Each structure stands twice: as C-alpha cells, then as structure tokens.
Amino acid sequence: NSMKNIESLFDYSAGQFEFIDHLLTMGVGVHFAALIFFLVVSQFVAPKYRIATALSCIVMVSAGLILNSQAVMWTDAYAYVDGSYQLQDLTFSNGYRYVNWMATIPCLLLQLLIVLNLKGKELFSTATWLILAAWGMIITGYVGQLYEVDDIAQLMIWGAVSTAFFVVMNWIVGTKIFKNRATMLGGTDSTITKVFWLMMFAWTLYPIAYLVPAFMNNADGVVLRQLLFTIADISSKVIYGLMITYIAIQQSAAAGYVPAQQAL
Numbered sequence: 440n441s442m443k444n445i446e447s448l449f450d451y452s453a454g455q456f457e458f459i460d461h462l463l464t465m466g467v468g469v470h471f472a473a474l475i476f477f478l479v480v481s482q483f484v485a486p487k488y489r490i491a492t493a494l495s496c497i498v499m500v501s502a503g504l505i506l507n508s509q510a511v512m513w514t515d516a517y518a519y520v521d522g523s524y525q526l527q528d529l530t531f532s533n534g535y536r537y538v539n540w541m542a543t544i545p546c547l548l549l550q551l552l553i554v555l556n557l558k559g560k561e562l563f564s565t566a567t568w569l570i571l572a573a574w575g576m577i578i579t580g581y582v583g584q585l586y587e588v589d590d591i592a593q594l595m596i597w598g599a600v601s602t603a604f605f606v607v608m609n610w611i612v613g614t615k616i617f618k619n620r621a622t623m624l625g626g627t628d629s630t631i632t633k634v635f636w637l638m639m640f641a642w643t644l645y646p647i648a649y650l651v652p653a654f655m656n657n658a659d660g661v662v663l664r665q666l667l668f669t670i671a672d673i674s675s676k677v678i679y680g681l682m683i684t685y686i687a688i689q690q691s692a693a694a695g696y697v698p699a700q701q702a703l
C-alpha cells in the first residue's frame with residue numbers, strides 16, 4: 440500500500456514534513472478535546488437522544504486513534520538526510536483513513552437518523568441502505584486509490600463508481616431530512632437543514648483530496664491533500680457532531696427533560 444500512494448514518491452523539505460506532522464497531531468488533540476466535551480454533555484441529553492452523543496465519542500476516538508497512528512507512521516517512515524526527509528521504510532499509507540471512514544461513517548449517519556426521530560422498522564431499514572451505499576462508496580474508493588500512482592485511469596473509473604454510491608446516499612439522506620423535519624422540536628426543523636448542507640460541503644472535500652494525484656502530483660499535492668483531509672475531518676466529524684449534539688439537547692429540552700432545560 441505504501442508504494443501505491445504518491446506520498447512515497449517524493450522527498451520533503453523540513454517545512455513540508457513538519458507541517459504535515461503538525462496537521463495530524465493537531466487533529467489528534469482536537470478530536471480528543473471534543474471527545475471530553477461529548478462525554479460531559481451526555482448527561483444533559485434525554486435518554487431518547489443520548490445514543491447520538493455517544494456515537495460522537497466513538498467517532499472522536501476512532502478518528503483520533505487513526506490520526507495518531509498516521510502521525511507516528513509518518514515519523515517512522517522518513518529520516519532527515521542531506522537536507523531533506525527521505526523515505527526509510529514502507530510504514531505509511533492513506534488506506535488507514537479509508538478504515539477510519541468504514542467505521543465512522545455508519546456512526547455519523549446513525550446519529551443523524553436518531554435526532555430525526557426515526558424509529559423501529561424505518562430506522563433499521565434506512566440505516567441499512569445508507570450503510571451499504573456508504574460502504575460501497577468507501578470500498579470502491581479504496582480500490583481506486585491503490586492505483587493513484589500506477590493507473591490514473593483506474594483511479595478515475597473507480598472514483599466514478601464511488602461517486603454513484605455517494606449521490607444515491609445523499610439523495611436518501613436529503614429525502615429523509617425533508618420529509619421528517621416537521622417532527623423536530625424546539626425549532627430544530629430549521630437547524631437540521633443547515634446540518635444537511637454542512638454535510639454536503641464537508642463530505643465533498645474528500646473526493647477533491649482523492650483527485651490530488653491526478654492534477655497535483657508533487658510534494659505540495661501531498662501537503663494540500665492532508666490539509667483538505669484535515670478541514671474535511673474537522674467539519675464532517677467535530678462540527679457536525681457539535682450540531683447534532685445541539686439538536687439533541689434542544690429537542691430534549693422541548694420534550695420536558697430538565698437537565699437539558701437547565702443546561703440551556
């Protein structure tokens with residue numbers, strides 16, 4: 440996997456190499472800082488919605504561990520030699536992020552469906568189609584990036600296939616949001632629409648990073664990709680979870696849960 444990603448193709452200046460290392464370790468801290476937040480405010484969420492804030496804690500730790508894993512893989516694979524960081528070992532690859540997504544994306548979708556107040560047959564039904572569409576998306580994406588060095592045309596046709604799953608997934612999500620937002624309490628029918636558009640923007644950065652190999656094949660493409668992943672991660676995982684949490688509490692208060700009312 441290491442040799443199949445463009446990170447292995449280049450030497451990095453100390454500035455590039457440390458910028459990337461600082462992006463990843465910063466991502467670690469941010470996710471684990473938010474984890475503590477998500478842990479604390481759980482007591483202010485009615486039992487109905489408490490699972491939602493719990494799923495954020497799962498996403499936070501899942502992301503934080505992969506980012507910490509990549510931060511160390513990054514420093515193990517390169518040594519500063521003759522004024523540049525040069526690959527020493529094949530211990531770094533992006534495929535671990537795609538593992539981070541296989542695991543976190545189901546949690547991210549499920550917390551959305553919970554605050555939409557879906558239940559029973561529909562919740563289980565909608566979650567199954569969304570998770571399968573999502574996995575098809577990630578899986579065809581993982582296959583394609585195995586070729587980002589050797590066969591760009593394969594990266595492209597696997598991206599096209601992956602994008603079909605993405606579009607179908609978004610249509611299901613958007614359709615459920617707009618048909619069930621009338622059930623949301625505390626005015627959260629207005630906030631959930633902003634969440635959907637937040638999702639649309641943040642999730643679309645990943646395919647943009649995915650394509651960096653095809654239009655910026657150089658050490659600055661590598662830096663740019665990690666910068667895009669960092670913005671996307673922070674937006675699709677942290678900010679998203681915060682808003683999901685805010686909707687969970689607001690609906691808990693509107694439903695008579697007192698710890699939510701006092702907290703607000």
Ligand SMILES: CCCCCCCC/C=C\CCCCCCCC(=O)OC[C@H](O)CO
Nearest residue numbers: 599602603606607609610612613614617618
């Ligand atoms: C390369 C493979 C082909 C690529 C071609 C891409 C086509 C782009 C079309 C739509 C964007 C998909 C996002 C769907 C946005 C949400 C849809 C939605 O929510 O529908 C509203 C609902 O009908 C109200 O009740």
Ligand SMILES: CCCCCCCC/C=C\CCCCCCCC(=O)OC[C@H](O)CO
Nearest residue numbers: 468469472473476480681684685688702703
């Ligand atoms: C490095 C840190 C970055 C990681 C993020 C830092 C943690 C929280 C930041 C902003 C929260 C604002 C968004 C949350 C809005 C609703 C939360 C809420 O209602 O909290 C109830 C009250 O605070 C309980 O006492």
Ligand SMILES: *C\C=C(C)/C=C/C=C(C)/C=C/C1=C(C)CCCC1(C)C
Nearest residue numbers: 577580601602605642645646649675
């Ligand atoms: C960390 C949370 C999320 C939701 C990550 C989301 C990732 C995607 C939406 C990835 C999408 C891709 C597409 C549409 C086609 C290129 C392959 C990717 C898997 C990067």
Ligand SMILES: CCCCCCCC/C=C\CCCCCCCC(=O)O
Nearest residue numbers: 471472473475476478479480482483
């Ligand atoms: C970088 C994060 C550092 C934050 C300060 C460290 C102190 C430990 C963190 C949180 C304290 C526990 C929060 C409990 C919430 C109050 C619940 C209540 O009012 O009953």
Ligand SMILES: CCCCCCCC/C=C\CCCCCCCC(=O)O
Nearest residue numbers: 541570571572574575576578579582
């Ligand atoms: C635990 C992860 C496995 C999940 C299985 C169920 C979801 C799979 C969804 C669609 C997978 C499409 C894969 C395309 C086949 C080509 C991959 C290959 O060449 O090995």
Ligand SMILES: CCCCCCCC/C=C\CCCCCCCC(=O)O
Nearest residue numbers: 591592595596598599600602646650
């Ligand atoms: C990620 C979304 C999918 C991107 C859509 C792109 C559709 C394919 C467009 C034209 C394919 C042309 C392939 C020729 C390039 C291969 C050889 C080369 O790059 O030098």
